[PDB]
């Protein structure tokens, strides 16, 4: 299972999302839950860089299984909307694949 | 092959996103790339319906693997940045899986 730990500060701004584990839905190469979450993650991160002035702190296990996004300029509205979008997309995957991915707000 | 037709109007606002071939046979790579694009698309629509006030004309034919977003308030800046985030995410997929997905701007 992939777990997605989200931390949201006093003002409601998303400052960290930490995604850990593997989906364990199918075989390597054909796991659709992993394909879903990955496309949404990397898509969002790259879009932030590409469409806004925010430059997030990114740290990850380049062998798979661990990605960390820390927001820097948390006040950036464009970047915060992209992060929200990401969360809603991943929630959409959670509600149909219950046992492969978990969101936890802190 | 998944095709993604994107229509931009004279002012730069995204009008239409059409994805097709979702539910078609496909070659090696299709299952995951289709899972990636669809999680990004349906994720984006949900975000546009939950985070903004825009209510786009949406037509999903689950049987056809034909999915169509038509923008209504094209001046909704938030909806428009969710759409351009989706495009970026879709481009990210194209860059590495050129054989399974194609984007066409109209």
């Amino acid at each position: 299972m992939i777990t997605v730990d989200i931390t949201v500060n006093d003002e409601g701004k998303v400052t960290d999302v930490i995604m850990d584990g593997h989906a364990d839905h199918g075989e390597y190469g054909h796991d659709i839950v992993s394909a879903g979450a990955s496309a949404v993650l990397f898509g969002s991160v790259n879009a932030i860089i590409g469409l806004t002035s925010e430059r997030p702190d990114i740290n990850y296990d380049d062998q798979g299984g661990h990605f960390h996004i820390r927001s820097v300029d948390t006040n950036n509205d464009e970047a915060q909307l992209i992060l929200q979008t990401m969360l809603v997309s991943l929630q959409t995957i959670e509600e149909e694949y219950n046992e492969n991915i978990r969101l936890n707000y802190k | 092959m998944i095709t993604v037709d994107i229509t931009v109007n004279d002012e730069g606002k995204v009008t239409d996103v059409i994805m097709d071939g979702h539910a078609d046979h496909g070659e090696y790579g299709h299952d995951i790339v289709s899972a990636g694009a669809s999680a990004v698309l349906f994720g984006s629509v949900n975000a546009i319906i939950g985070l903004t006030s825009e209510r786009p004309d949406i037509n999903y034919d689950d049987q056809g693997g034909h999915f169509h977003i038509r923008s209504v308030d094209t001046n909704n800046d938030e909806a428009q940045l969710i759409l351009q985030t989706m495009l970026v995410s879709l481009q990210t997929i194209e860059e590495e899986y050129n054989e399974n997905i194609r984007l066409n701007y109209k």
Binding site: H22, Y28, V33, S38, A39, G64, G65 | E96, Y97
Partner: peptide, 11 residues
Amino acid sequence: KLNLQFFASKK
């Protein structure tokens, strides 16, 4: 680059 199997295991 992008890896759609970033969150899938080996075994």
